Amino acid sequence: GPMEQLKHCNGILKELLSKKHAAYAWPFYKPVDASALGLHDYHDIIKHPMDLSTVKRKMENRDYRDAQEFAADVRLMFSNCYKYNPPDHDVVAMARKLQDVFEFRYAKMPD
Ligand X SMILES: O=c1cc(N2CCOCC2)oc2c(-c3ccc4c(c3)OCCO4)csc12
DSSP 4: H
Enumerate the H helices of the chain as residue ranges.
2-16, 22-25, 34-37, 42-45, 52-60, 67-84, 90-106
Least CB distance to ligand X at residue 71 (A): 19
18 vs 53 by CB, closer to ligand X: 53
59 vs 91 by CB, closer to ligand X: 91
Least CB distance to ligand X at residue 99 (A): 12
- Kindly list the residues in this chain that would bind ligand X in the complex (CB under 6 A): 27, 32, 37, 39, 81, 84-85, 89, 91
Cβ atoms 34, 56 nearer than 8 A: no
